[PDB]
Amino acid sequence: GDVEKGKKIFVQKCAQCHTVEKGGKHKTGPNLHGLFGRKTGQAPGFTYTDANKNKGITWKEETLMEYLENPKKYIPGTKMIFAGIKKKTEREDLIAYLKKATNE
Amino acid sequence: GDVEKGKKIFVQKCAQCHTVEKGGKHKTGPNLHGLFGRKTGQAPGFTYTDANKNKGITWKEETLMEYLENPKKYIPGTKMIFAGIKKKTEREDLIAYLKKATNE
Amino acid sequence: GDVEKGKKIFVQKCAQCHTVEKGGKHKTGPNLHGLFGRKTGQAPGFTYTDANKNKGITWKEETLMEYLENPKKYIPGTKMIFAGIKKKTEREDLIAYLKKATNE
Ligand code: HEC
Ligand code: HEC
Ligand code: HEC
């Protein structure tokens, strides 16, 4: 595989939601560092859909090749954009900030 | 709730689509200034889905807690990304612009 | 139509995914230069959905007016955000890059 071309593909189609560096930050999507040889939905600090959290497979060339071809087909129920916040604590904190920030 | 903590959440999951400050601009989503105590779909100058426009509830701790847990469940039909432009005149202006810029 | 207003509409609701200038880059969506008088899904260098690729209509005021009011109704199956990579080649390159970058 051509790593050089890979980078460019990532910048145009993935970077908007993903970071790859170690210690990288979470955005719309989880940080991808340490992806290979690891099971789906295990990036620390990120809240996945139950589907991505339980797909159960290990990310590698074969699995990635099939997933990236059609994510929704490989993992029915996965969501690429905001679909809500599960943790009650998280929602509470967000709402606290909102009651303050939107009340200038 | 924790205001600080909530800000990091907003920045990571909401900022790309929402502004909170008074007079702040609409983006993909409506500016959220004066959210609390206001009825759904009432931000001046933003075109909501008929669903969000007519949900008929008032934004507050409880209503927001349920909505943020699962947006589309609370307001079936709500759209997070471009789903079209209702106003005929707006589509006309936009098209006149494209007619100019894409042929230049 | 009012081009000046049209430019404002495009900046707020289209710019994030589309460029218009000749030689413009492809982002989430395809560069739109040369849109008028061309068949759907004909932008060089962009991988459209089979739906957008074969809608078979010519982009003109009449067609755009309908499309812009409700895209998915006009072209069912069309996707506005990442829905997968068709070409096995790109997937291999992307995966080769990830293999390196995510392993820092
Ligand atoms: C935002 C609009 C995204 C774009 C564009 C891309 N991805 Fe993504 N990805 C996104 C989210 C929110 C999620 C999780 C969804 C869920 O169901 O919880 C993901 C997840 C992945 C994963 C799996 C990670 C894991 O299981 O730990 C991979 C491997 C992945 N995304 C890859 C990927 C690539 C390579 C992209 C560009 C081609 C890409 N994504 C774009 C959000 C978004
Ligand atoms: C990203 C979040 C987008 C936004 C916002 C807008 N568009 Fe888009 N558009 C996007 C994609 C990914 C695609 C292709 C979808 C597919 O099925 O492959 C498109 C396509 C168009 C087209 C047709 C291009 C062609 O036939 O060659 C047009 C005419 C178009 N989009 C226009 C457009 C305008 C004017 C927008 C704002 C009002 C707009 N798009 C937003 C992604 C996104
Ligand atoms: C991307 C686009 C987003 C993201 C990532 C978030 N929201 Fe927001 N939001 C968006 C839109 C286009 C709409 C309106 C949808 C429709 O018309 O059906 C909204 C609306 C809200 C609302 C209700 C506003 C109102 O009734 O006046 C709220 C309270 C809201 N969104 C909040 C919100 C928060 C706190 C987010 C982060 C967790 C968030 N959104 C993300 C679009 C988008």
Residue ranges per domain, chain B? 1-104
- Count of positions (residues) in chain C: 104
Closest CA to A20 of C92, C95, C101, C97: C101
Query: Can you tell me the distance from the alpha carbon of A28 to that of A88, in angstroms, rounded to the nearest whole number?
Result: 19
Quickly list H helices, chain C.
3-13, 50-54, 61-69, 71-74, 88-101
| b (16+ CB within 10 A) / e for C25-49 | ebbebbbbbebbeeebbebeeebbb
- 3-state secondary structure labels for all residues of B45-79: CCCCCHHHHCCCCECCHHHHHHHHHCHHHHCCCCC
CA proximity to C70, closest of B88, B85, B94 = B85
Q: Which 3 state secondary structure label does DSSP give C28?
A: coil
Nearest to C102 among A2, A17, A32 (CB): A32
Any chain C CB within 8 A of the CB of B91?
yes
Strand partners, B58: B39
What gap in Å lies between CA C23 and CA C7, rounded to an integer? 19
Closest Cα partner for A46 from A70, A74, A18?
A18
SS3 category, A67? helix
Q: C79 with B82: CB under 8 angstroms?
A: no
Q: Rounded to 10 degrees, what is the CA torsion of A61, A63, A69, A71?
A: -140
Using DSSP's 3-state secondary structure scheme, residue A74 falls into helix
Q: How far is the C-alpha of C25 from the C-alpha of C1, rounded, in Å? A: 26
Residue A14 is assigned to a ligand binding site: yes
User: Considering only CA atoms, which of C51, C41, C40 is closest in space to residue C83?
Assistant: C51
The Cβ of residue A62 has, within 10 Å, a number of other Cβ atoms equal to 11
Q: Which ligand is nearest to the CA of B87?
A: 2
Place of tokens 């993909």: B28
A-C Cβ pairs (cutoff 8 Å, strict): 93
The bound ligand whose nearest atom lies closest to the alpha carbon of A77 is 1
A45 inside 8 A of chain B by CB: no
C48 lines ligand 2 (CB under 6 A): yes
**Residue appearing with tokens 């959905």:** C49
CB pairs under 8 A between A and B: 91
What class, spelled out in words, does domain C1-104 have in CATH?
mainly alpha
Calculate Rg over the CA atoms of chain A: 16
Residue B98 C-alpha, separation from nearest chain A C-alpha, in angstroms: 23
Here the tokens at position A87 are: 């943790």
Helix (H, G, I), strand (E, B) or coil at A6: helix
- DSSP, collapsed to helix, strand or coil, labels residue A39 as strand
- Residue A36 is nearest to which of C26, C81, C102, comparing CB atoms? C102
Chain A contact present for B102, CB below 8 A: no
Most C CBs within 10 Å, among B91, B100, B104, to test the C interface? B91
> How many other C-beta atoms can be found within 10 angstroms of the C-beta atom of residue C52?
20
Query: Which amino acid appears at position B42 of this protein?
Result: Q
Cβ contacts of C89 within 8 Å, gap of 6 or more: none
Residue C81 Cβ inside 6 Å of ligand 1? The answer reads: yes
Least CB–CB distance from A21: residue in C25, C91, C104: C104
Q: What sign does the dihedral A85-C76-B41-B23 (CA atoms) show?
A: positive
Token pair for C46: 């962009």
Residue C74 near residue C67 (C-beta atoms within 8 A): yes
Tell me the two tokens of residue C29: 């969506």
Distance from C-alpha of A74 to C-alpha of A60, rounded to nearest angstrom: 14
Residue nearest to atom 34 of ligand 2 (CA): C14
A88 and C CB contact within 8 Å: no
For residues A64-100, one letter each, b for 16 or more C-beta atoms within 10 angstroms of the residue's C-beta and e for the rest, the string is beebbbebeebbeebbbbbebbeeeebbbbbbbbbbe
Neighbours of chain A (3+ CB pairs under 8 A): B, C
* Chain A residues within 8 A of C103 when measuring between CB atoms: 33-34, 36
Tell me which residue of B104, B85, B102, B88 sits closest to C60, measured CA to CA.
B102
User: What would the two tokens of residue C43 be?
Assistant: 């932008």
Q: Distance, CA B104 to ligand 2 centroid (Å)?
A: 19
CB-count burial class (<10 Å; 0-12, 13-18, 19+) for B88? exposed
Query: What is the C-alpha to C-alpha distance for residues A83 and A48, in angstroms, rounded to an integer?
Result: 10
B14 is in an annotated binding site: yes
Q: Which residues pair with residue C12 across a beta bridge?
A: none
Tokens of B9: 């959440």
**In this structure, are residues B69 and A85 in contact, taking their beta carbons and an 8 Å threshold?**
yes
